[PDB]
Symmetry: C3
Subunit: 140 residues, 3 copies
């Protein structure tokens, strides 16, 4: 009965955090923002410090969840993808090539100097430099 209780209590705490607007759950992932806007490198640091990672959508469902955060907070969001070494070749921060995409029409159109990806409030993507201030969204 220790284990049933443990699960119930976890469900309660997650429920509270969800109600408060502090987390969104999509499958195995939890997304969260504290509402702050900073550049891409600072978002990475902020998420890592919290024990998570800069958010990236790998499915339509995850894109929709992150989009809803962009919408609720009315700001563009940096995503956990880059095209550093290879150009036009976006990779997650774990090194793996991106699969799911949701590019805004015409994108990625980027310079060799647009190594980051931002999400617009409508959930679509634009390759961009990494020094803009964007909503910090993390995944856990």
């Amino acid at each position: 009965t220790e284990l049933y209780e443990i699960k119930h209590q976890i469900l309660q705490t997650m429920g509270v955090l969800s109600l408060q607007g502090s987390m969104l759950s999509v499958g195995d992932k939890v997304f969260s923002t504290n509402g702050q806007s900073v550049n891409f490198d600072t978002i990475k640091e902020m998420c890592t410090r919290a024990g998570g990672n800069i958010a990236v959508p790998r499915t339509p469902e995850e894109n929709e969840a992150i989009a809803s955060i962009a919408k609720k907070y009315n700001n563009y969001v940096y995503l956990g993808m880059i095209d550093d070494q290879t150009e036009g070749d976006f990779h997650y921060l774990d090194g793996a090539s991106v699969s799911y995409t949701n590019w805004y029409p015409g994108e990625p159109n980027g310079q060799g100097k647009e190594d980051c990806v931002e999400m617009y409030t409508d959930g679509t993507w634009n390759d961009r430099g990494c020094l803009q201030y964007r909503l910090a969204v993390c995944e856990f």
Copy 2:
């Protein structure tokens, strides 16, 4: 030692949420509000979306907990009871007849068109229509 640790960490997270004023614990139940006022149907949706249910007190202790939220937020609260099909016969949303009551004197006095229950800041109840804006309180 995995299990002891797990319990400690749950206690910590619940402690934090409690300190922050984001949850109240009464026996097996956790109550929470995000401070928003909406109608009865929208409260149900909001609580369900968070993984919970619109709050209802089934004991004096639960009434007191929900009352304290009504007081802290200075608003009347819709409770998880209705008298839809039967009239004067209040039921929880699980279909079961209500046991514990805390009616304000003279109540329920309601029209066939007072199918919901609201709680006043003093913890007492009034049957009411369901289209008023009331503090959203959920249970998990």
Copy 3:
């Protein structure tokens, strides 16, 4: 697989709370404040009500964590130590003699009527009366 899941979900909720700025984790301890300032006795009550205790640093790492809260909230903080019965002899609230100290130069200089300990925003300590208003920081 129930147990792995349970651990992941706990890590997620702690991550969210950390991101939100609602908790700091140092070893086995979690520190949190709701931002309120009250006297020493009221802090004890507030922390106990949440299921925790008034915070006290017992290591350099814990002092630094509590200092960062003092800094972020720009207020002095009461710590969980007193010199009630014995004078000049500080004890934790569990009765045990204090080990780690971080006194500001000249302190403790206190009257027999400075039975509490406050922390300055720079992390150093001053013995003080207990009736001042200080930032409430709890440990769990």
